[PDB]
Design a protein around this ligand. Sequence first.
Ligand SMILES: COCCNC1CCN(C(C)=O)CC1
Ligand SMILES: [Cl-]
Ligand SMILES: [Cl-]
Ligand SMILES: [Cl-]
Ligand SMILES: [Cl-]
Ligand SMILES: [Mn+2]
Length: 340
Amino acid sequence: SMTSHSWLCDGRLLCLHDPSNKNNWKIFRECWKQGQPVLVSGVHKKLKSELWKPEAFSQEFGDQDVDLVNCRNCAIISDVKVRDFWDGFEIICKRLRSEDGQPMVLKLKDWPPGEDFRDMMPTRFEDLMENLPLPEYTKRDGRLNLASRLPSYFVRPDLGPKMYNAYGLITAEDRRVGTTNLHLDVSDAVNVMVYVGIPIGEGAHDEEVLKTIDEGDADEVTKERIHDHKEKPGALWHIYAAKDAEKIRELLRKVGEEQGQENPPDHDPIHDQSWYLDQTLRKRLYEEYGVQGWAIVQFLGDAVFIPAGAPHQVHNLYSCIKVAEDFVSPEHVKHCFRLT
Ligand SMILES: COCCNC1CCN(C(C)=O)CC1
Ligand SMILES: [Cl-]
Ligand SMILES: [Cl-]
Ligand SMILES: [Cl-]
Ligand SMILES: [Cl-]
Ligand SMILES: [Mn+2]
């Protein structure tokens, strides 16, 4: 039976089922006001699937110059062609190799660059913006998006959207690495999974993905969603409430000191974007500081809503294309005010 919604994270996470239901706001706004993230499934079914394929990005834009990041060691690969990233997205025998001779796990940095998505990809821009869920919050001109309506006393988001493209992490050692390290944003954001690429060549890689979700602390309903196939899992998220951000800074200052970093007592380990909370660190956060988070598996066509001020990290299970839009809801406008 079709239903309006269900729960994940043992009742702590709202999952909306119909991305274009005109009554979603009634269920959404209660959870959102409490500072919780929200998941909306099914956005892929609303999009033109041919616009979101890795082979189309390589064909249309492959001669552009870009920088990559090696996710395993943070090394920058400078001034290569964007086809050198796209042609290895799913086919492992085509990836750039590290000195050890292994294929690299790469992230495509700042592409399209700055605010240039709309100019570079006008048809993709239309297809995404016309199909975003909770459109009074998420459209540039929505009635509940204050982005265009605030004076300079508020930090305003850049013009979006922003594309996030990276390979999947593969090995047991990779389980402790982020695709995007722990950080926070002063705006709200909606992040849509528009494509998941499950490779071939070193395909048969299904088993290390199950251990990563399990050790990642994913709930039994998410695990059921994983274990009976049907939907493709893209990325494992951990999100923390904005009210817990200072307790997380205290843990990361204690760990930086234990590991012989030499940091001033006030430095900001979340703003530094240098940490990934692995299973050891997540357990220490819970046991030593009393802080629980939300472990979220983002499948193809899932939209993750991330509240302003909420610390969050992302670990790709397979190769992912994500597109995100920032917005300023009235519920969370305090997080971008420049005084007090
Ligand atoms: C249309 O969906 C096809 C589902 N592909 C499956 C998704 C689940 N995978 C996992 C759990 O690694 C393996 C391949
Ligand atoms: Cl808040
Ligand atoms: Cl386009
Ligand atoms: Cl809405
Ligand atoms: Cl990062
Ligand atoms: Mn973010």
